[PDB]
Design a protein around this ligand. Structure first.
Ligand code: WH6
Length: 358
């Protein structure tokens, strides 16, 4: 690889791993459209299995970027509209608080205070109906953003209804397969089990547990190679031959709401480039990122801006991931780790790397 890339990546990542006691890590840098890969440490400590370019990591909430684009693809196919009432796709949802709550609000966490997590107790379809029926908003729709798996999770489930496909089948057929993400999974198959890293939390080996609307909100597993290709695809959607997928990617980076200096897309979050690093670094802290904040409506939404820092953080109990890119600069990064280490450390390292290559 170019020495510049080698040196910035290693000088930033080595101390990060040391400081954060990360068992295993994979990093991709996309530089002028081409990926460069780096790996450290262990996918499985006990069995002495190293992290490779084929190792699967739990993306956690980075999954929301796939959900957003899949929703975008459905919009482009004419199957749904973000302006549609939630009730259009869920006729059993009769409770009056849902009047005025649209697919846009679900997708962008602005329904009025849907909770971060679907309760563990919610198992069945009848349980889920009861949960959403009984949910009482703190705020009018389209006034406050509160990051929520229960929000974008429901969006994901409803966006695929008109197709008649399950969420997983829809994602496989319409996103993963066209983009040749052949080692990206909602459910890891037996054939790939040898490559599936353990997550580590408080020293114990852990994998994500099943939960309602998990696929839609936090359930994707992927390799560093497929994630680099995912970044390439979002960096440069005009290279994508499938027209509805191309438009869907573009819609996911449209700017729907603004809070502080961030803009909410479908899954993706964006800021103008050049960014104030302090703002993205400090803003990634879950203190801020999980806080209820007032939003300004962008009416109508701004199309995907090339001069953006586009990103998403995501975690599970045992994994920590970050993806960021700058379309204008054909520059991007993917950082996958099998420890949930603090968001700001992720973003700081990503900033340092991309800033040096920009
Ligand atoms: O960083 C993210 O991607 C979002 C966070 C949001 C979240 C969900 C549940 C409990 C949490 C506790 C502290 C902080 C965030 C939490 N998140 C999740 O969204 C999430 C889903 C599943 C698991 C699991 O290991 O079963 C863990 C998490 C998880 O930490």
């Amino acid at each position: 690889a170019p020495q510049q890339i080698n040196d910035i990546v290693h000088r930033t990542i080595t101390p990060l791993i040391e400081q954060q006691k990360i068992p295993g890590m994979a990093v991709a840098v996309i530089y002028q459209g081409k990926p460069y890969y780096f790996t450290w440490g262990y996918a499985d400590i006990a069995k002495k299995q190293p992290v490779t370019q084929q190792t699967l990591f739990e993306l956690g909430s980075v999954s929301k970027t796939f959900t957003g684009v899949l929703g975008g693809d459905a919009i482009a196919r004419g199957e749904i509209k973000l302006s549609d009432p939630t009730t259009k796709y869920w006729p059993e949802l009769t409770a009056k608080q849902w009047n005025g709550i649209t697919l846009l609000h679900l997708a962008t966490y602005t329904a009025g205070g849907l909770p971060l997590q679907v309760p563990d107790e919610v198992k069945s379809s009848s349980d889920l109906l009861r949960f959403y029926q009984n949910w009482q908003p703190a705020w009018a729709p389209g006034t406050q953003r509160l990051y929520a798996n229960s929000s974008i999770g429901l969006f994901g489930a409803l966006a695929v209804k008109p197709s008649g496909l399950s969420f997983e089948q829809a994602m496989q057929t319409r996103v993963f397969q066209p983009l040749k993400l052949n080692h990206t999974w909602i459910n890891v198959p037996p054939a790939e089990e040898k490559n599936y890293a353990w997550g580590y939390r408080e020293g114990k080996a852990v994998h994500v547990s099943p939960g309602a609307l998990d696929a839609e909100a936090y359930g994707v597993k992927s390799t560093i190679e497929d994630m680099a290709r995912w970044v390439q695809s979002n960096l440069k959607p005009l290279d994508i031959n499938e027209k509805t997928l191309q438009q869907g990617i573009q819609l996911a980076q449209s700017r729907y709401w603004q809070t502080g200096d961030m803009y909410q897309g479908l899954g993706w979050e964006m800021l103008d480039w050049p960014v104030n690093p302090d703002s993205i670094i400090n803003g990634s802290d879950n203190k801020i990122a999980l806080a209820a904040r007032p939003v300004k409506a962008i009416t109508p939404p701004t199309p995907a801006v090339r001069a953006s820092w586009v990103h998403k953080t995501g975690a599970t109990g045992g994994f920590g991931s970050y993806v960021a890119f700058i379309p204008e600069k054909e520059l991007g990064i993917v950082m996958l780790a099998n420890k949930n280490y603090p968001n700001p450390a992720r973003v700081d390292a990503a900033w340092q790397i991309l800033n040096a290559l920009q």
